[PDB]
């Protein structure tokens, strides 16, 4: 059944609840992005008003094939009433048309749902700076100490640099990307944008990315691999045996292979600096796993949490054991003990 952490009290709301058939009670289903575990359920079939953003819109529009009389578009940054209660869209710094939903409750109770987000300092100069939050529906993906990595600054210049230094000593070298969702568009971006190439991949990432409002689009991406040097497959794909193939594929166009699997967290993190990272290479393959994040480090989401002084928070993500629902429950007090909220 639908957990209670997809349901906001006092409305008729639930959040990122697709899978569990008609919800009772429901009025309006929101979905705060376009990833897979958060519309799953969702297909042409559906009948219930979906509240989104713009971009979230256009994804279940042409990939999903959601019905249009159905897909309620809100705008960012502007207050909006939705069955009778004061909503707000806020950028949630995660994929393209992410959002974080503010609810004014008819009784002075107002609530902030995350959705999936990757905390910043700019958050503190949104409408969020204007009143209180009493609740906070939290992201706690890496809600745990251990949990460092760098900027997305930081780690978009070493591709860069990685990627151009390669290809302009060897010419004939290969940049291939993974990828198996919206999300991360800056790393093949910024690498096919130092190699004045465009990205080149399927017909079914092609339509995606058309969906996503980055300007100028038409100017970086394509479907003709043959004109291109820096593309795009399946994450799964992105191993020794699927590159050799890929190569195969390329008939002596290239003879080198530089891959980029854009990982969340891997326990190298811990240890080893972003200057520092190395590749595994068999032969003329070699496969950088890079710490490129869209959810909030330790750090970033502690941050947030101080600044924001909710009475009460409400975790999303890794509620299904006891260890770590005590573990989360354990830093939101001593977060609370030393700002002294
Ligand atoms: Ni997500």
């Given amino acids: 059944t639908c957990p209670f952490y997809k349901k906001i009290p006092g409305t008729g709301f639930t959040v ?4 569990y058939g008609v919800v009772e009670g429901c009025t309006a289903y929101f979905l705060t992005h376009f990833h897979s575990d958060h519309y799953a359920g969702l297909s042409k079939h559906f009948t219930f008003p979906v509240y989104c953003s713009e971009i979230t819109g256009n994804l279940l529009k042409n990939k999903l094939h959601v019905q249009e009389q159905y897909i309620h578009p809100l705008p960012l940054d502007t207050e909006c009433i939705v069955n009778g209660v004061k909503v707000v869209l806020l950028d949630a710094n995660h994929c393209p048309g992410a959002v974080m939903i503010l609810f004014y409750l008819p009784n002075g109770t107002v609530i902030l749902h995350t959705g999936d ?6 958050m503190e100069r949104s409408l969020l700076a204007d009143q209180k939050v009493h609740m906070l529906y939290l992201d706690t993906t890496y809600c745990s100490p ?3 990595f760098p900027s997305q600054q930081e780690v978009i210049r070493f ?4 990627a151009f230094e390669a290809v302009t000593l060897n010419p004939h070298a290969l940049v291939v990307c993974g990828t198996y969702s919206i999300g991360k568009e800056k790393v093949f971006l910024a690498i096919a944008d130092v190699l004045g190439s465009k990205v080149g991949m399927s017909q079914e990432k092609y339509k995606t990315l058309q969906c996503l409002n980055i300007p100028e689009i038409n100017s970086l991406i394509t479907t003709d691999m043959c004109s291109s040097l820096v593309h795009l497959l399946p994450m799964m794909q992105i ?3 699927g590159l050799q193939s890929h190569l195969k594929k390329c008939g002596g166009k290239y003879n080198q292979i530089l891959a980029f699997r854009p990982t969340g967290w891997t326990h190298s993190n811990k240890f080893t600096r972003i200057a520092d990272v190395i590749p595994q290479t068999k032969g003329n393959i ?3 796993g890079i710490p490129y994040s869209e959810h909030s480090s330790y750090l970033e989401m502690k941050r947030f949490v101080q600044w924001l002084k ?3 928070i409400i975790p999303t993500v890794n509620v299904g054991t006891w260890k770590s629902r005590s573990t989360m429950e354990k830093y939101f007090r001593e977060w609370k003990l030393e700002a002294g909220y």
């Fill in 159 to 162: 591709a860069i640099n990685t």
């Fill in 146 to 148: 251990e949990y460092t």
């Fill in 310 to 312: 909710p009475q009460k």
């Fill in 16 to 19: 990122d609840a697709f899978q």
């Fill in 286 to 288: 070699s496969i950088y």
């Fill in 117 to 122: 987000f990757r905390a910043d300092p700019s």
């Fill in 239 to 241: 191993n020794f045996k």
